[PDB]
Design a protein around this ligand. Structure first.
Ligand SMILES: [Zn+2]
Length: 191
């Protein structure tokens, strides 16, 4: 009853437990424990360092955002904010993070984009904290890649995000800012 805003997205998720399959449109899905994703973050950090582990998780999220954007861009093809929010809503549906809008300005025709989102109940921040104490830098790398991947697909241009605040840093919740690559001064992203 409460899912009026995401009913089009929920209808494309098919659970087939008797045959061991979960489908999101043409994509096959898994239901995995968040605690298991700490192990990957764990071993990768000890083996690769920080920036190499972060670059990996960002690339993973970036591909998932494109995957989701390929499906959601059919359900809502229209320069509309309510159409763009399919991504933030998919993030919530898949149990990864709750997006809360502070400000969203966008337009596909003008190639403009400004996003100021809060991230509540971040799975990645909890996963990061269960393996490491509070960090010096924000930790929601997979979520940030998904924001960049999904936004860049539906906007038709490179959209880069930065996590200004993070639970894993000691802040109360996470927060991100999204802008096109040209509007960032440090627009040399190695990922
Ligand atoms: Zn965070």
């Amino acid at each position: 009853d409460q899912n009026k805003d995401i009913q089009d997205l929920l209808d494309k998720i098919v659970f087939d437990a008797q045959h061991g399959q979960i489908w999101f449109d043409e994509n096959r899905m898994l239901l995995m424990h968040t605690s298991i994703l700490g192990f990957l973050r764990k071993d990768l950090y000890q083996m690769l360092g920080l920036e190499r582990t972060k670059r990996f998780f960002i690339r993973c999220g970036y591909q998932a955002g494109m995957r989701d954007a390929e499906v959601t861009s059919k359900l809502r093809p229209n320069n509309e904010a309510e159409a763009f929010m399919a991504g933030p809503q998919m993030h919530g549906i898949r149990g990864m993070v709750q997006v809360e809008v502070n400000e969203l300005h966008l337009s596909h025709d003008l190639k403009q984009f400004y996003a100021d989102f809060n991230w509540l109940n971040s799975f990645e921040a909890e996963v990061h904290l269960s393996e490491f104490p509070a960090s010096d830098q924000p930790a929601c790398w997979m979520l940030l890649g998904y924001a960049c991947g999904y936004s860049s697909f539906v906007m038709g241009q490179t959209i880069i995000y930065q996590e200004t605040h993070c639970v894993a840093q000691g802040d109360e919740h996470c927060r991100i800012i999204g802008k096109p690559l040209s509007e960032w001064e440090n627009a040399d992203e190695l990922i």
